Amino acid sequence: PNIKIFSGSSHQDLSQKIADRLGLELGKVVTKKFSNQETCVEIGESVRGEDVYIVQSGCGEINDNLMELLIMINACKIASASRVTAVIPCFPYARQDKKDKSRAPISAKLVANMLSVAGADHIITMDLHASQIQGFFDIPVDNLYAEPAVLKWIRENISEWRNCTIVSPDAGGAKRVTSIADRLNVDFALIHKEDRMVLVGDVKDRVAILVDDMADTCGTICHAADKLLSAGATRVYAILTHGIFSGPAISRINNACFEAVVVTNTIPQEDKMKHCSKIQVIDISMILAEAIRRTHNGESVSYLFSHVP
Amino acid sequence: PNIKIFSGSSHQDLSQKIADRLGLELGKVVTKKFSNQETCVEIGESVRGEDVYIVQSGCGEINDNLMELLIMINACKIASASRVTAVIPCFPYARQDKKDKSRAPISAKLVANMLSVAGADHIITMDLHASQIQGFFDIPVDNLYAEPAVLKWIRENISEWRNCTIVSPDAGGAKRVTSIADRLNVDFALIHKEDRMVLVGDVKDRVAILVDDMADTCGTICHAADKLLSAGATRVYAILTHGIFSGPAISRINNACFEAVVVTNTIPQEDKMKHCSKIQVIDISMILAEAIRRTHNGESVSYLFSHVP
Amino acid sequence: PNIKIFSGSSHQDLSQKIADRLGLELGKVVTKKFSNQETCVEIGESVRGEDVYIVQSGCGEINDNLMELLIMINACKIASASRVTAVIPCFPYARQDKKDKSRAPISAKLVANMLSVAGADHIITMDLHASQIQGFFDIPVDNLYAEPAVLKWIRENISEWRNCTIVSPDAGGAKRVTSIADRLNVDFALIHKEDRMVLVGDVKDRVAILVDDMADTCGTICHAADKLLSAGATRVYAILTHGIFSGPAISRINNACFEAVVVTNTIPQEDKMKHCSKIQVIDISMILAEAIRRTHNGESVSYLFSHVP
Amino acid sequence: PNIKIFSGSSHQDLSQKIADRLGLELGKVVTKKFSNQETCVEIGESVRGEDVYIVQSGCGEINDNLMELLIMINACKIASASRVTAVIPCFPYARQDKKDKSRAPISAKLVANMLSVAGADHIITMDLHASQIQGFFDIPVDNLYAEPAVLKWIRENISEWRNCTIVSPDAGGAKRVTSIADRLNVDFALIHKEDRMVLVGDVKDRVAILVDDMADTCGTICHAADKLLSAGATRVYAILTHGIFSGPAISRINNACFEAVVVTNTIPQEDKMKHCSKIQVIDISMILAEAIRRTHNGESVSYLFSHVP
Amino acid sequence: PNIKIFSGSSHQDLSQKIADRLGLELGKVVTKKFSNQETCVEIGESVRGEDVYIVQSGCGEINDNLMELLIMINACKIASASRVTAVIPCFPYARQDKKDKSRAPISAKLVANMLSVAGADHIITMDLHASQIQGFFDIPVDNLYAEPAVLKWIRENISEWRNCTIVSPDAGGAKRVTSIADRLNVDFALIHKEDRMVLVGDVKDRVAILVDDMADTCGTICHAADKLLSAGATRVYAILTHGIFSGPAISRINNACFEAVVVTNTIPQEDKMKHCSKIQVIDISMILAEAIRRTHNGESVSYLFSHVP
Amino acid sequence: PNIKIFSGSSHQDLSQKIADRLGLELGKVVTKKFSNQETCVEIGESVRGEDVYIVQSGCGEINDNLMELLIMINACKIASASRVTAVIPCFPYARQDKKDKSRAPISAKLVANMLSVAGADHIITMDLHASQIQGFFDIPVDNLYAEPAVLKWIRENISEWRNCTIVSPDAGGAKRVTSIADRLNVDFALIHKEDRMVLVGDVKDRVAILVDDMADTCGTICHAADKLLSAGATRVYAILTHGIFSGPAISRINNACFEAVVVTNTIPQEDKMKHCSKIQVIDISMILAEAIRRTHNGESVSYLFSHVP
């Protein structure tokens, strides 16, 4: 059983980078739309008794990409692939992980069920919005962390990183920032809204680094950055693993005080970089490639939680 | 347990017509998109211990509508609805019902599995592309027929209907046309391609009526109509239950010789009627409403296979 | 994991031919009936961590054979076989693939569900009545084609095959005949009933070849052959992949004008050949053996759709 | 939701008796065989939102009857019956309830799985060979007892019943006989083979009553009766809930010393009574009818374990 | 894929013995309780693509041990183990294998379902209370037998074993004793209660050996031993595969006439041996180790039904 | 370990045919000459832990091709290929298999030694000039036979093959012709030179078929054909497995009386067919492909000695 890497249409550059790091050519697949907008998928090579990895992120036209992924999984499964793994760098509907006093769907659970019923045997993803989403599956889920790469970027790009403060934009992300604050041996601050925001932790004359899983409309991080500049911070950075940047995010970032907005490339960023000078990208394709290769060879994946490969 | 009718965004006029025929107000639901294009659904009323019917056709932005339907089904199911029924007038991915010497998905089966796993207890649909799709489910599926309404339209709109010929555009649909030919006591002709088409059955000086389940790009029916005019037909009609009309269909129909292109309203047609004079619509909302009401009251649904209500 | 081939009682000659082509001895199994007619199965060898293939066709005493197959699958699965494959040359209840305005079962779907619940991981079959039956499963199904062998037989047995006409007995099978007509570069004709039959396509002074998936009572092909002789055909052949020949089929064929009735050996034919001189058999055991060997070795099975091994 | 009773072809007299006791007409169903021996089923009336009971015993052509039952269950389930119950007076493959140092199937578990996957919601049966078969299901199973009726027959037919000895033919059935011995306040004896049999318990000058679940070939009960006459018994009776009587059973009973062989009518007995004078039948249709009516009305079924209705 | 053996807290000595016989070190796992008595499990080594065997018997604090086993199975399954096997020497809730005229659970079936849903692919157990419990699973179950070891113990410890009588304490276990009686070529006796017990079979001046699957409170075997001494037996032994010895069992055995009470070590016995001199233990770790090694290597397990390794 | 097929420059068409039959792309290799005519080889893909097959025949510039093959074998072996197989359809220096009263080399043995020392683990060849060359190796050698294909060609191309005579050109090849004569049930004749030739066996009015391993200069077969026409033969064919056709062979064949000169394609023939009308080619790429696939999968190769795949 050999590795076969197939790309969905969502993020073809990432799939190519992963394939090069694996020393493979991207599997031959045709993924387009019929005239009536139904997703047309044709696997261009035999996947029999192979270990198939399908790379597709929850970005762009999310429902189209999700249906493409499900259809590709189904095609590979009924084509007698030995094992089918969904490599989903940004998990779609991850923020709909609970109901919370609303007659709402748990869309993340529905997506997990659909992936399972399509025939996925394994999920590889990066920085799930809530790690409880792992429990939405009955198949194994490897939730990788961009932190090795975020810490690397911070050390090699922020000269004052030893005196910086890692800041959570909200009470929800505090855990994450504390983890980073522990690995850098720096202070960590929290910010919560009461339209006013309250900040705990000295940030005067120090570089502040907001950290988060995802920036969609960037209202949260822009308000946090305004508050950080109010409290005497020298420069404010924002580091996010998922740069969705939908709606007015680009205009708000352009009007914000960020020195840089660093995001990983779980979502393609070339178009946003054109219209926003201060967006920067951290490659995490090495982490994804190493996770694929370790799942294939039966080596430890959790080794990657703390080690940059 | 009362009837609750909810509309997806795909076909709101049809849902309203069904609700009026049932004497009900469309259930309160908010169905929109978040900024990052994730489907947001909020059920605006309690559906506890109710018999819920969600109307959504496989039309327009098909993957968006399908995800909306699945999310709404899930929301109603975890909101403790007694029973959830998907009313899908045009079934999405119905034409992907087999592999046939290709490493292709069976997308119709995947859609059926997704509907089942979302929590659908029952499916109501009209003129499935292949009735074998009924076997793709383990829940009951009521496949209604537009034929009572097509026959009604033919009798009240084609003055020469007793001397007409019902024509299949291809060998696949012959069964359907024979059924119609049996109910009208008229001749039936077949047309098959060898770029040339061959026609069996006298059509000279007689009105010809092409009959089909769906017109997507209308290449099939336009070629058939050209052949029918070649063979001395007086006028050529086309009657389809599903008027998808994607791609170049409107231009081809405008350049074709059809007297009329009659389609049912399983798919909204107002925009296409603006740009195509010869499109006409047969209301099938009475059949759908009667099917809903009979499933709710435990009356016979198959009664509708031969009776216009 | 090695190949183990087990024979049901339905078609032992075919199982032996397959085993010889694989270079194996048929797995030791006792398959008989208790006094009260319950199916007794005993696997006479260990199948642990083996790739098990059970050969059983839907022929003869169909319900007995189907229960035998399910019981054997269950016995191998709880005996810790690594993988269990059902090799079903003629799929039982394949013609009950839809309801169609009747309160009828979808028996083909029920059979698929029973095979899955017995523990089948994979299905190998030949010329499914409707390829949509593939969607009745969630496990992979390889639907082989007898066409490579039918084309071979036509070329080596009909001297006038370049000027012949391939004829469908009904509108349903037209696809199949067109495929054959494409591979031979000959004309193709259709025949449909209006008790009268209508034929499209010149057949005068030409050899006609009716083609079909199955001959049960042979009313269809006998009526078609009578019509073909009415239309001036020189000789009429019939080629079917499944020769069920139940009821009055043998008498009708004996009284018909067929030059030959060629069937594959998916169903044993020795008894019918005794009472019908014009039945001939095309061996497809090479296709089945190659499919088994390719599924075992992870080679391409679809290679066989166009290549005689 | 109303009661609909449908009969399989196995035991139509029992189904009619049950229908009369319920005050209903047997549901309209056509259950025959196609020419090629495939089971043809057509439900002749709507079963929508009804409580459907299908009566079929594991007797006669067992695999044919079992397939008929599964097909009928499937037809009713996809016809949108509110609930489907299988009334199986004699459960097929019940004696294959374990492996026991053999590479054998657990056929009873396979049958249970097939019934569940066909869509049965509930099982009603009488005197399961092993009550552990109840655990083979995940749906509720009501295992009725013929004992109220056996005790009634014993009291009204054996004048010396107060001085009789209830005898188990083997060590396996002892529980059953003890139950009966407790309800009659009589002695109970056991018989076990060491070709020789050993009997414990005084039987001289006393009427002996062998009791068992089923007589298939009647070797067991005939050997037991020979031993009982050897030990000075006055008359020997045999009472069995299931009179299968396959193979040489009728000849052995005719040559045996039984005063009577009483069986229930879970299996039709008219043909056997023709060739065997000493077979007598205890009607249990009242127990089955009361169980059906109590499951329908939500009354206690276990009330019937001790009360003759 | 390598063997990984993990121990639950129930029987660590047995797990160590098995690990030594396999030439392996027990897998690193932490299995303790949090303060609030929730089971805490941490797998201390990677189990990716490994063949995992978790040893846990149904003994001691049964519900705690069962939950520990389920949690460990789940942890290994979501840690991407290739296969997870539960090695359960004494199966918990095995005696709750049926309802029998009681509104009782079938707890054995519930345990089987829980093991399956936790992710067990395979079960290895010894002397199931009823072999029908095998049918409660859909995964393969290997039910080993202590009989090779019981027969070995009898021959090497009872000098008069050729003239002994094997005795069943009740009618239920007779099968077992007959098996033993067949393998030793000795007489077999039965004992059943009518507070009085009746014994069939000469036992005077002969050594009697009661045989059973399990001794919980030992009322059954103590009453049987009293009866055997009443009937002139010289010495009475008791041999049980599962020595649960709960409640007053130790006091009753101490006051009983047994020469020895031999049990296997499916349940730890050191504490009971302290307070009961006549308890002796037969090691069955060789049978369990050989079964593990044969399932891993794909060799025949049933070979062990008759051969001591 | 996967199959990797690499082509030398000698016979690229054959390598491509083999690769297509295996469903593979020819391995990437650069095989050219430096300016000073040293053979330059570069393996363009990783062959680590792969099963490598290098196809190179002893044809054309024989010493260049042999050195290319040795260099490619060495490159693959020091690149850590798991196994390296030389597929040599025509074995070079095969005719130098002995000394025979001459101070000559045994060049075939030298070639075998060089292949072994380069690192070949296995040899696949067709119709070795002397099968004793197999003993020149210590590695396994599979010597395939073109006979299945020669017999096939004879039956499908020579209408009088049942009355033909198979003729050996010399006493050395008699064995071969007898084999063929046995498989066709025809007469076999020998021809030996005393410049005169003597023929044993009636050939008058019968088609004669000279059979041989190789035609280099074709003096032997041309003299034999002249003698056969002298002895009253009707037509003379020549069938050779290796068509070397060096020196004056083409002119002699053009001036000879052969109806056809059939050779296999172990050596490329396109150039010779241009200048010689009566040369015909029998494809043996199926035999070579099947041998490669069977050696890879561990199936029987000798199965091919008598079976055309």
Tab-separated table of C-alpha atoms in Angstrom, chain D residues 97-101 103 106 109 113 130-132 134-138 141 145 147 171 174-175 179 188 190 192-194 198-200 300 302 305, chain E residues 97-101 103 106 109 113 130-132 134-138 141 145 147 171 174-175 179 188 190 192-194 198-200 300 302 305:
chain	number	residue	atom	x	y	z
D	97	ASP	CA	-27.464	-20.950	18.442
D	98	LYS	CA	-23.760	-21.579	19.168
D	99	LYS	CA	-20.492	-22.846	17.695
D	100	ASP	CA	-19.221	-25.239	20.399
D	101	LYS	CA	-15.708	-26.262	19.261
D	103	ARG	CA	-15.986	-23.897	12.715
D	106	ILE	CA	-24.249	-19.137	14.456
D	109	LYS	CA	-27.766	-14.879	15.066
D	113	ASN	CA	-29.503	-9.846	11.996
D	130	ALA	CA	-32.798	-21.336	23.684
D	131	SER	CA	-34.026	-18.147	25.311
D	132	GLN	CA	-30.551	-16.684	24.764
D	134	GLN	CA	-33.590	-13.160	22.612
D	135	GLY	CA	-30.168	-11.581	23.127
D	136	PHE	CA	-29.336	-12.099	19.459
D	137	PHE	CA	-31.677	-9.173	18.762
D	138	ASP	CA	-31.534	-5.515	19.620
D	141	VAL	CA	-38.589	-10.104	21.392
D	145	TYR	CA	-44.942	-20.160	26.121
D	147	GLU	CA	-47.168	-24.213	28.763
D	171	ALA	CA	-30.468	-33.121	30.330
D	174	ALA	CA	-34.923	-30.520	32.359
D	175	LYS	CA	-35.733	-26.903	33.231
D	179	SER	CA	-41.544	-25.968	35.366
D	188	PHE	CA	-40.193	-35.206	37.286
D	190	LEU	CA	-34.596	-37.182	33.634
D	192	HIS	CA	-29.640	-39.159	29.517
D	193	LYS	CA	-27.539	-41.392	27.228
D	194	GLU	CA	-24.233	-42.754	28.497
D	198	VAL	CA	-30.217	-43.986	32.124
D	199	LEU	CA	-33.410	-42.850	33.879
D	200	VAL	CA	-33.682	-41.243	37.300
D	300	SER	CA	-49.002	-6.570	29.476
D	302	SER	CA	-46.141	-11.357	30.255
D	305	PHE	CA	-46.957	-16.541	30.686
E	97	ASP	CA	-27.537	-14.181	29.161
E	98	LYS	CA	-31.354	-14.341	28.951
E	99	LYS	CA	-34.592	-12.929	30.360
E	100	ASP	CA	-36.641	-16.081	31.084
E	101	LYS	CA	-40.110	-14.808	32.097
E	103	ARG	CA	-38.538	-8.088	33.039
E	106	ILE	CA	-29.797	-9.243	29.013
E	109	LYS	CA	-25.624	-8.661	25.391
E	113	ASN	CA	-22.561	-4.147	22.560
E	130	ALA	CA	-23.095	-20.038	27.727
E	131	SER	CA	-21.488	-20.348	24.314
E	132	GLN	CA	-24.511	-18.532	22.869
E	134	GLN	CA	-20.593	-15.738	21.102
E	135	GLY	CA	-23.676	-14.822	19.076
E	136	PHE	CA	-24.118	-11.649	21.114
E	137	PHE	CA	-21.180	-10.250	19.127
E	138	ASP	CA	-20.716	-9.404	15.492
E	141	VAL	CA	-14.978	-14.363	19.551
E	145	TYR	CA	-11.370	-24.132	26.993
E	147	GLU	CA	-10.337	-28.648	29.617
E	171	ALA	CA	-28.514	-30.483	34.802
E	174	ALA	CA	-23.935	-32.050	32.101
E	175	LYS	CA	-22.553	-31.425	28.609
E	179	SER	CA	-16.994	-34.077	27.486
E	188	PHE	CA	-20.357	-39.466	34.593
E	190	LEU	CA	-25.718	-35.970	37.352
E	192	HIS	CA	-30.395	-32.194	40.399
E	193	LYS	CA	-32.580	-30.716	43.171
E	194	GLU	CA	-36.224	-31.748	43.404
E	198	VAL	CA	-31.111	-36.681	43.530
E	199	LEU	CA	-28.009	-38.382	42.098
E	200	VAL	CA	-27.869	-40.758	39.147
E	300	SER	CA	-5.197	-22.063	13.954
E	302	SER	CA	-9.013	-24.229	17.483
E	305	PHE	CA	-9.289	-27.000	21.951
